Structure formats: C-alpha cells, structure tokens
Write a protein that binds this ligand. Structure first.
Ligand code: MG
Ligand code: MG
Ligand code: MG
Ligand code: MG
Ligand code: MG
Ligand code: MG
Ligand code: MG
Ligand code: MG
Ligand code: MG
Ligand code: MG
Ligand code: MG
Ligand code: MG
Ligand code: MG
Ligand code: MG
Ligand code: MG
Ligand code: MG
Ligand code: MG
Ligand code: MG
Ligand code: MG
Ligand code: MG
Ligand code: MG
Ligand code: MG
Ligand code: MG
Ligand code: MG
Ligand code: MG
Ligand code: MG
Ligand code: MG
Ligand code: MG
Ligand code: MG
Ligand code: MG
Ligand code: MG
Ligand code: MG
Ligand code: MG
Ligand code: MG
Ligand code: MG
Ligand code: MG
Ligand code: MG
Ligand code: MG
Ligand code: MG
Ligand code: MG
Ligand code: MG
Ligand code: MG
Ligand code: MG
Ligand code: MG
Ligand code: MG
Ligand code: MG
Ligand code: MG
Ligand code: MG
Lengths: 64, 52, 76, 51
RNA sequence: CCAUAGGUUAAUGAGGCGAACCGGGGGAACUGAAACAUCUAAGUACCCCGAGGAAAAGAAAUCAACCGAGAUUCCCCCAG
RNA sequence: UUUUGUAUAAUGGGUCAGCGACUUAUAUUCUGUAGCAAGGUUAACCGAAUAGGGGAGCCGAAGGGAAACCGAGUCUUAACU
RNA sequence: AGGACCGAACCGACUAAUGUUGAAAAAUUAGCGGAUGACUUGUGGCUGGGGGUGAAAGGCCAAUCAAACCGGGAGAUAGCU
RNA sequence: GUAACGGGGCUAAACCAUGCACCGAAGCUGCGGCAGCGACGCUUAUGCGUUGUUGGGUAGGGGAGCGUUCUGUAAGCCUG
RNA sequence: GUUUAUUAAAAACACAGCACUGUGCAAACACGAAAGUGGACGUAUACGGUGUGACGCCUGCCCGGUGCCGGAAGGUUAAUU
RNA sequence: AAUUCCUUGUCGGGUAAGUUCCGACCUGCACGAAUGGCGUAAUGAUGGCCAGGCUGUCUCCACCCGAGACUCAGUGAAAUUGAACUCGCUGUGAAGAUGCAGUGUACCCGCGGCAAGACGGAAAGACCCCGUGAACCUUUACUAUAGCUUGACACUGAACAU
RNA sequence: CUUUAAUGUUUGAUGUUCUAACGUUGACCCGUAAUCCGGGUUGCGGACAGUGUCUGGUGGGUAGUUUGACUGGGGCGGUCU
RNA sequence: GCUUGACUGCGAGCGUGACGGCGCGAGCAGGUGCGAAAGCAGGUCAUAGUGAUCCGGUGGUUCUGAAUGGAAGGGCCAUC
C-alpha cells in the first residue's frame, strides 16, 4: 500500500528549493512576556531544520 | 509569585499594547509612560489597562 | 543526605588566544567579573563578555597603575 | 544472503547486532521515535494553513 | 340478540440441507498508542435472519459554479 | 551461546539421517546499470493481445511567503546598504 | 425414648511402616472414627463458566479450577531468552 | 599432603658490582608464493625486471565467488 | 456432625439458642432484557438477611468519625421553560 | 494468657536437675464484654503436662523364621548421556579441578558392597529482583456501568374548590 | 415612576369528587375435558400505579485499567528543575 | 536633578548545546531621554527567580472566506 505521511509533521515542515525543510521556532506561545524582546524577535523569523534531524524529517515526509 | 502582569495600551487608538508587571500593594495610581508605537511610528503615551 | 547538586558548566574562558586572527564581533573571552578589560577595538558586553569591534590579531598586554590585563585588536 | 555461514560475513546475527529491537522479529520503533521524548515534529508548534 | 372469537373440513404454499460470495439484525477482545480510558484494532472475528445466480444499488428534492454535466455499479487516477 | 571474563564445577546437545529461520506484496529514498533527455513515462482499459493504441495522470525544468500575492527573485519591515 | 453406648456389614480416612521409574498418576498392611442417622446407597432428573454449587477449604464443577474444556479472533503480544 | 625456590638440588647453582659470550618469539633478516593499495616507466578496459608499502580481528560496513534445484540455450550435447 | 477428592480433620465450618434489622403478601428478596418462577400454595407464633454460637452468671461508657433511620424550614442544585 | 517484646518475669508445687506444665502475683509492650466476657458437667483419632502398668524406644544390640538382595537358566526396562585413554596432593584458574602447573602414586579387568565427589539425576528457581508482563481480590484510587432512587414529558382525562 | 386597591388573562400549587384511559397475581361466565391465555360481566383501585425518553443522586453489585524511576539487591528513608 | 531606551524593526560576526534551544553582539533604520557637548541608554555588577507542544480565551489585521456578496471558522501579529 501507499506510504502514509505523518500528518503532524506535514503541518509544520515545508520543503525548500534545495531540499531543506523550514519550521517556526518554539518557545513563543504563552510565556513570552517574561522573555526579552531581542529573544522574541529572533524567534519570529523562520528557521532551517538542523542536519541531525534531516533524516527523521525525510522519513516522516516521503512524498514531499 | 504575587506580582501580577498588566498591559499598557497606547492612547492613539491603534490597538497596539505593551505588557509588564506592577506591584498592587503599593502604587495604586495608574502607570503612564511614553513608549514607541509601531503603527504610527512615533513615541506616544501608553496607559495602563487590564489583561484579558 | 541533603546535598549533591550542581549546575551545568557554562564553558567560560578564553576562546581566541594571543595572535589569533578574528572577525569583527567575535567574542574573545567569557568571564565573571572583569578579569580582562576592554582595550582598543574591543567591546564589552552586558555580562562583561569581550568582543572584537574590528578585524585583526588578538594581542594581550599589561598596562596601567593597577597592573591589570587588557585585550586589544591591532587592525592592519 | 545473511545468516548462511561464517564465510558469508553475516552469519549468526544477520547484520542485526546483539539482542536489540532490530534483532527481534518484527522489532523496531515507529517513525519519529526519539527514545521516549516527544519528537521534534511535536516539540515545535503548528503554523499556517493550506489555501 | 345479531355478530365475533373459536371449531371442523378442502385446496394450494412453506418447512430442511449446502462451499464461498450478497443484504440486513446484533457485535467483541487481544493488539497499536512503546502504560492506559478518548481513539485504534473494527463494524473485523463471531452469532442470527433472508435471498439470488449473482446480490445490493439504481433513473437526481444529484453535482457543479454563472460554464455545464445528466441513474446505479466497477477499475485507474485525483491523493496519502 | 551468553559475557568485563569460561577447561570452567554457567546454558545447549545420546547419535545418525531428513526437515528447520531475513521472505513476499506495495510505496518511498539512496547507489549501481541501461535508455531517452529539458523533458521522461504511461495506469486502468482497448487490442490477436509481452506489439500497437491509450499522456487520464505522475515527476522535473522556479521560487519566496502563513496566505493573498509577487516572481529570478521573494519574504521580513515604514524602509532595508 | 435417643443426631444414646460397645461392635461387623457399610461409610469415613487419625497414626505409623511400606511403597515414591509403585500392584496403585494417592494404594496396601496393622491399628483408628461413625455405624437408626445432620446416616448410607442404587437408578433417573435439575442447576453451566464471571456462571454453577459449596455445614465455606477459594473447595468442587470428567486425573485440569483465584475463573472448566473445545474451536475461533490467532501467526494475540513478548523492550525478554 | 611436604605445600611460602614449579621440583630436584645448591654454601654458590644466593645476593652485590663489572664484563664477554650464548639461548630465547609467529618480532627482525634471508629465499620463495598469494593478495590489497598508492605514484611512476612504456603501455594503459589488458598488462608488463614495475616499484613502494600493506595484509590479527568480534559487532559491523564494502568487494568478489562456490555449490544446490528449476527455466531458456536444449527436438542440442552425455548415456544399456 | 462437616471440611481442603490427592501432604492440613483442627481451636476452623455447621450447630440448637440469643439479639438486631428488613418484610402486610402483586411481601421483602433472589433467578430472569421480559413473561414468569422460587419465597409459598406459607401470612409477622411467617419469611429473608446479619452477627453471635448449648447451658450458667452477665453483656458496662462513647452518636465526634463512617453508615443507617427520622425530619423539612432554609441554603445549594438536573433535565424542562 | 492460642494475646507478655523485655522474658527462661517473680514466688510456690511437681523433678536429683523443669526455658514446658499447674497455682498465684499484675508490671494487660499490645485482654475485655454478642467481631461477646468469665465459668462449665459431658463429649474430643483436640493441644500441653504428670503418674502407674507395660515393654528392644533405649543402655546395646543378639539370635531365629520368612520375602528380597547373591548364583544359575528364561524373558528383559528406565531416568541420563558433548566426547573420554575418567588417580592423590598443593597451587593456579568465570575466584571449590579426573582434564592446567608441579609432584606423588598406580600391572590389565570383573563381582559383591558403602554413598564422599563428579557443584550427581528430576523439573528454562517457587525465595529475591526485573518487564511501562498476566491474573484474581480489596477500597473514601480513576473512569464508567447494571441496579436502586428523583423529577420533566409521553401513555394521561373531566369537574369543582381555594 | 413609585405605591399599587380592584379587574380579566396566562401559567402553575395543592385539596376534594368523578370515570372513561390504565391496573387487578378480586368474583363470575365462555372459548374448555384447562389454577395458562384471551374475551365477556362485575367489584375494587384510578389519573395514581406502572412503562418509555431525558435527567440529578446513589452504586466494588459488575467491569476496564492505573498505582514512576534512581538506588553498592529491593522496600522504607532520601532524591528528580 | 531631569526622565521612561524596562524603545520598534533588524542585525555583520561569534559562543554553547545531539537537538529543541540558550547566551553575547558592534553596526543600520525610525522615533526617544539625559547631557552644552564628546557621548550614553535595546532594564537591574554578573551568573538562579523557571515549563515545550497540543487545546481554549482576549485584542489587532483588507490574509483566507467551500456558487457569489458577507459571515462563521482558520491564518498572521500582540497576548492569556
Ligand atoms: Mg563481521
Ligand atoms: Mg544472540
Ligand atoms: Mg541490536
Ligand atoms: Mg498498548
Ligand atoms: Mg436459479
Ligand atoms: Mg560443562
Ligand atoms: Mg542435557
Ligand atoms: Mg535507475
Ligand atoms: Mg504497452
Ligand atoms: Mg495533460
Ligand atoms: Mg533576498
Ligand atoms: Mg449413635
Ligand atoms: Mg461403634
Ligand atoms: Mg518414606
Ligand atoms: Mg462416640
Ligand atoms: Mg479436578
Ligand atoms: Mg477470566
Ligand atoms: Mg482454546
Ligand atoms: Mg487479530
Ligand atoms: Mg506466537
Ligand atoms: Mg612479521
Ligand atoms: Mg525439469
Ligand atoms: Mg488431603
Ligand atoms: Mg470427603
Ligand atoms: Mg488428612
Ligand atoms: Mg462463632
Ligand atoms: Mg453517627
Ligand atoms: Mg448525632
Ligand atoms: Mg513467650
Ligand atoms: Mg519455678
Ligand atoms: Mg499460669
Ligand atoms: Mg478480643
Ligand atoms: Mg457492648
Ligand atoms: Mg461487639
Ligand atoms: Mg467429632
Ligand atoms: Mg486432653
Ligand atoms: Mg509410665
Ligand atoms: Mg570421573
Ligand atoms: Mg582434587
Ligand atoms: Mg583446589
Ligand atoms: Mg559395580
Ligand atoms: Mg549403600
Ligand atoms: Mg546409600
Ligand atoms: Mg519498573
Ligand atoms: Mg476492580
Ligand atoms: Mg487492554
Ligand atoms: Mg525501581
Ligand atoms: Mg460556501
């Protein structure tokens, strides 16, 4: 049968041009006020998936 | 922790606000500060409000 | 017992030594209190972290009445 | 062809090592298992919508 | 009291068996979730009823999207 | 066989013969190889039928952004050297 | 008269020896308790598995019982050997 | 059961200090053989006085093979 | 008297007796999706449940906790509107 | 004390000597009144203790009668078993050696016996621990649920009085 | 607007009296050779009881499960950022 | 004494982590405060004062709006 994508990972990672995956930074949901503005500002932009986790992401996302 | 978080709402009506904390035992008077408003790109007076 | 506690080591110390070429903004040493003081072309962070304000070679020197240790960057 | 004698180089274990999950019949953890922690695709928050 | 229930005849028909497939009435747990309740397993196993050579479904109070298509069933896509 | 470590007084086997354990399907990624090549390839099905037809689709040649959108740029921001 | 007494059949099974791949997957030998009773026994019948039945030990329910046996789910699962 | 030189035995066959020998390993060196790899000389998918060097091995990774049954080759070939 | 058939026959269980409590008979209760049946073709001098366990002398104090019974004014409170 | 930890409590009786028994004492670690208290004739394959009789239970075993064991003939198993050309000692060593080192001893092979060893045989240890094992059972563990109970609506209507 | 006196209305709260739903494991008749059932007559009860949906309370009666790890074995103690 | 830089958008280059992440940062843009100015200020001498994701709540937003116009809901920003 067709492989089923892990739907939780498909809603958080988008494939990029050179095969990478972008995700939003964590730690920015509901305890952010006590965090310095500089810390919050750096978490706002999108980030690249680290090399260690590339294999796990590709396994969860076989069709994308 | 007994200090409670508050929000400072801009008077310009943009709806932007900052958040901070204040001691409720002392300093009952409302907090007024001049802070930068990103919507109007100017430093305006921010007024204390209730987080909800 | 009521002991057996510690915190993870914060990896302080000298990261770039004398004569090393560094890029602007690279931190040379992380410390607790001003063990080293900022000299020419060297900035001081809010936690007394000394960082390079220009490209060049790291040089350590001792000057002043207090016999203190200073870090400067010779930007060629 | 593993497990077909000493000379084959894959005998008596079939390349699976010694008594792990990979050595059990039908053994092995599911995709995204991080040893017990919630995996990275669950530590991180969801974002966006599909148009 | 008529009636009705009931009773006695006479005609037809049905009874049971049989592999799977089919429709319907009921309907688990082990297991997976590295535990476990929602969930999964699964409307599966099993039980029951009924029918046929097929059954079921079926001739739009259906879809489309401002263009149109024109009952149902089945296959490949759409698409993990 | 299991172990840091077994002549070990740790497990296994009385012996022989026969049998006895990494397979299969689908999908996906990588390598090798062959073909074609900015293109490649069809599935069901049709078909005297391993041919041929069928390009329905799928992947690739363009990305950025949550998205609308823009596009060799794009997002972020009022704007970015 | 008696859930009276002594004591065979009958029924029980307290002690000891033997037997422990037995004559016997619970018995034999010598003693022992009850022996007109809440006794014992024959032939039929009824109660069915989360149920039965139990003068109650988790006992018994076909040499199996803190949940019988048979088939099915089923190649349950087994981070263990 | 001697059992605290392995034993015999030793007054040096012990210890100390100098020497010169010898024994001693699958180490090293000779004389052959096989294989992997590196840069060369010509030639190089082949290979050549090549040369230098390497070749203990579990888990495990890589590479190259043997043999068994069956299909084509094969209405061929082997065989009273 | 009964009990762990097959290592325990006992001080364990049962027992007559005693007390509490439920039950007015389409009884309580129990087995049953239900019908029904048992209780019982019985009727509180009866039946069920619980604890104690002949007989003799006796069974003292605590209703705060937890249950049960009685009360219903007030507080709180579901479906519904 | 079926209850007493300290404990063989203390005293008395029984004995030559009694951690048991019997009688008291009370200091009841931690008895107690129908989860009954205390007594109680009779009963008991009931528990403990004592005395007489009686005896091979014993001092201390002896003999004898039978059935096996032993020999012969016939029939003819079993558990177990890596392979054995299967000695002692001391030391070493997966840390208790028939198998290693050293050394001593020992002609080859049966039969009747004894069980010290072969960590002898039996049965993937019941104790201990572990597994995000199983099962039963308990409860003011969690979530439910049968049952019981409450009300609204329906089956279900009329009239009158407040 | 308050205070509201009366006025009809619309919903409820009880109490009383009916019968016609419903109940009858009261009597009698028939089906009928019948302690079932059904029908009829009559009496009693009666808008209750009882049942359905929804709903609050109760509920080891019965289920499905949970009940951590480190640790000079484990538990207990301590610890977990 | 005067004040709100306990500023908004960003950030060359580094540090420390398996990762999630955490930390340091000159400089740039817009607006500020204190100084006459050079200049300093992106909280506190520094290192503890803390909690991921999911789900739900609040405000903002021409991002989306299942035929169309809205809307619900979702997204983004701020935040519980
Ligand atoms: Mg190998
Ligand atoms: Mg193994
Ligand atoms: Mg392994
Ligand atoms: Mg599970
Ligand atoms: Mg036919
Ligand atoms: Mg052995
Ligand atoms: Mg064996
Ligand atoms: Mg290829
Ligand atoms: Mg074709
Ligand atoms: Mg096309
Ligand atoms: Mg760009
Ligand atoms: Mg008698
Ligand atoms: Mg007798
Ligand atoms: Mg014996
Ligand atoms: Mg008697
Ligand atoms: Mg049995
Ligand atoms: Mg069971
Ligand atoms: Mg079975
Ligand atoms: Mg199954
Ligand atoms: Mg199995
Ligand atoms: Mg060599
Ligand atoms: Mg053939
Ligand atoms: Mg017995
Ligand atoms: Mg018996
Ligand atoms: Mg017995
Ligand atoms: Mg009793
Ligand atoms: Mg009370
Ligand atoms: Mg009271
Ligand atoms: Mg004692
Ligand atoms: Mg005495
Ligand atoms: Mg006494
Ligand atoms: Mg007592
Ligand atoms: Mg009392
Ligand atoms: Mg009492
Ligand atoms: Mg008796
Ligand atoms: Mg006695
Ligand atoms: Mg005597
Ligand atoms: Mg031997
Ligand atoms: Mg020995
Ligand atoms: Mg020894
Ligand atoms: Mg012998
Ligand atoms: Mg012997
Ligand atoms: Mg013996
Ligand atoms: Mg555990
Ligand atoms: Mg339970
Ligand atoms: Mg389960
Ligand atoms: Mg533990
Ligand atoms: Mg719509």
């Amino acid at each position: 049968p067709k492989i089923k994508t892990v739907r939780g990972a498909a809603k958080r990672f988008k494939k990029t041009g050179k095969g990478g995956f972008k995700h939003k930074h964590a730690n920015l949901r509901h305890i952010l006020t006590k965090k310095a503005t500089k810390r919050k500002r750096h978490l706002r932009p999108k980030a690249m998936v680290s090399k260690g986790d590339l294999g796990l992401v590709i396994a969860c996302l076989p069709y994308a | 922790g007994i200090r409670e978080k508050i929000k400072l709402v801009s008077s310009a009506g943009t709806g932007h606000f900052y958040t901070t904390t204040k001691n409720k035992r002392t300093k009952p008077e409302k907090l007024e500060l001049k802070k930068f408003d990103p919507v109007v790109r100017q430093h305006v007076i921010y007024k204390e409000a209730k987080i909800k | 017992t009521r002991n057996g506690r510690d915190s993870e080591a914060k990896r302080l110390g000298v990261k770039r030594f004398g004569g090393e070429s560094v890029l602007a903004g690279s931190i040379i040493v992380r410390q607790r209190g001003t063990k080293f003081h900022a000299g020419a072309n060297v900035g001081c962070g809010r936690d007394h972290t000394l960082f390079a304000k220009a490209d060049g070679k790291v040089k350590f020197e001792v000057k002043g009445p207090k016999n203190r240790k200073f870090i400067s960057i010779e930007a060629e | 062809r593993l497990g077909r004698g000493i000379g084959s180089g894959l005998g008596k274990t079939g390349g699976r090592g010694h008594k792990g999950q990979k050595s059990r019949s039908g053994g092995g953890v599911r995709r995204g298992f991080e040893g017990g922690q919630m995996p990275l695709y669950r530590r991180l928050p969801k974002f966006g919508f599909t148009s």
